[PDB]
A paper describes a structure:
TRIM7 catalyzes the ubiquitination of multiple substrates with unrelated biological functions. Here we show that TRIM7′s extreme substrate promiscuity is due to a highly unusual binding mechanism, in which the PRYSPRY domain captures any ligand with a C-terminal helix that terminates in a hydrophobic residue followed by a glutamine. Many of the non-structural proteins found in RNA viruses contain C-terminal glutamines as a result of polyprotein cleavage by 3C protease.
A more recent over-expression screen of 118 RING E3 ligases (including over 50 TRIMs) identified TRIM7 as a potent inhibitor of picornavirus Coxsackievirus B3 (CVB3). For 2BC, Trim7 PRYSPRY at 13.15 mg/mL in 150 mM NaCl, 50 mM Tris pH 8 and 1 mM DTT was mixed 100:1 with the 2BC peptide (NH2-TIEALFQ-COOH, 100 mM in DMSO) and crystallized in 1 M Sodium Potassium Tartrate, 0.1 M HEPES pH 6.8. Solving the co-crystal structures of each complex revealed that the different peptides are bound in the same PRYSPRY pocket, with the penultimate two residues responsible for most of the binding interaction. In each case, there is the potential for hydrogen bonds between the terminal glutamine residue and TRIM7 residues N383, R385, G408, Q436 and S499. Investigating this further, we found that mutating the C-terminal glutamine in the 2BC peptide to alanine abolished binding. This suggests that interaction between the glutamine side-chain and Q436 in TRIM7 may be necessary to position the carboxy terminus for binding to R385. We only observed an increase in PRYSPRY thermostability upon the addition of 2BC peptides ending in ‘FQ’.
Residue numbers in the entry:
A (entry chain A): -2 to 170
B (entry chain B): 3 to 7
Write the structure that this text describes.
């Protein structure tokens, strides 16, 4: 299966996040790193982008997910706000799944959409900038989790967020 | 809980 080779972009990462040495993994620490505050860096929300974004075409990757609450992942428009506390909503240009309250959610607004998908281990993300959609599938049977249909009007970046300790996200391949 | 997501 042809998947994009992605690495987490340390210049974007919230300083509380810990990125693995291979730049595939992210979790939350309780120590803020002393990092330079670039305009691209998420200074309050616990977010990081991949270093690669996309303006056209179709792209796949997979995300290995922790069993416990605290993560959300998907894609963000490049213009996603980086500074101060921002909402985690489609209006803010984030299109994500989340594990919170021991429930899986598609992060719709104003109310999140609870998913009855069973336990998740690894999720395939299918980003389609030709038709305007981002879809999520559980890898065991490729059951469909959710599709956001979006007329994306800018470059779209893989998005990861971890807002509590005790969980993680990891990029494959 | 997810305020900072």
């Amino acid at each position: 299966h042809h998947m994009v080779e992605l690495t987490l972009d340390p210049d974007t990462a919230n300083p509380r996040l810990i990125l693995s040495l291979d730049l595939k993994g992210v979790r939350l620490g309780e120590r803020a790193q002393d990092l330079p505050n670039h305009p691209c860096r998420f200074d309050t929300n616990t977010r990081v982008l991949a270093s690669c974004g996309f303006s056209s075409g179709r792209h796949h990757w997979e995300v290995e997910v922790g069993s416990k609450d605290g993560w959300a992942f998907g894609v963000a428009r490049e213009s996603v706000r980086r500074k101060g506390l921002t909402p985690f909503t489609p209006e803010e240009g984030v299109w994500a799944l989340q594990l919170n309250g021991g429930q899986y959610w598609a992060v719709t607004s104003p109310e999140r959409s609870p998913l009855s998908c069973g336990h998740l281990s690894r999720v395939r993300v299918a980003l389609d900038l030709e038709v305007g959609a981002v879809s999520f599938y559980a890898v065991e049977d490729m059951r469909h989790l959710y599709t956001f249909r979006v007329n994306f009007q800018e470059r779209v970046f893989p998005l990861f967020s971890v807002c509590s300790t005790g969980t993680y996200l990891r990029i494959w391949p | 809980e997810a305020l900072f997501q």
